[PDB]
Design a protein around this ligand. Structure first.
Ligand SMILES: [Ca+2]
Ligand SMILES: [Ca+2]
Ligand SMILES: [Ca+2]
Ligand SMILES: [Ca+2]
Length: 111
């Protein structure tokens, strides 16, 4: 069992409100599996550019992907391109992560 981000890169608009992130499970599909994710600060900041999130992604037997939305924080203040990262971790017993196993998000400014 392998798990990774697909898409691994996300290009998002500051006005976009929310975007879906997607993690995929490959190999044996027949057993329950899970992986934890957590946003991580980059040149973009939790609290000011996006709202931080940590979670558990559960894959029941038979399901090979999980999606989750992340909220982008809009404002009226000019910036240039900025990144933050979502990272995977604590995969359940059978699981080994593959690349990408950290997703990259660029917030394109609009102001
Ligand atoms: Ca910023
Ligand atoms: Ca911003
Ligand atoms: Ca804006
Ligand atoms: Ca802005």
């Amino acid at each position: 069992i392998r798990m990774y981000f697909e898409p691994g890169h996300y290009t998002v608009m500051e006005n976009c409100g929310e975007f879906e992130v997607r993690v995929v499970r490959r190999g044996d599909i027949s057993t329950y599996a899970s992986v934890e994710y957590e946003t991580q600060d980059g040149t973009a900041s939790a609290g000011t550019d996006f709202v931080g999130r940590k979670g558990l992604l559960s894959f029941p037997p038979g399901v090979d992907e999980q999606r989750f939305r992340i909220e982008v924080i809009d404002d009226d203040v000019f910036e240039e391109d900025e990144c933050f990262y979502i990272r995977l971790f604590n995969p359940s017993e059978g699981v080994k992560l593959a690349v990408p196993m950290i997703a990259t998000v660029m917030i394109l400014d609009d102001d």
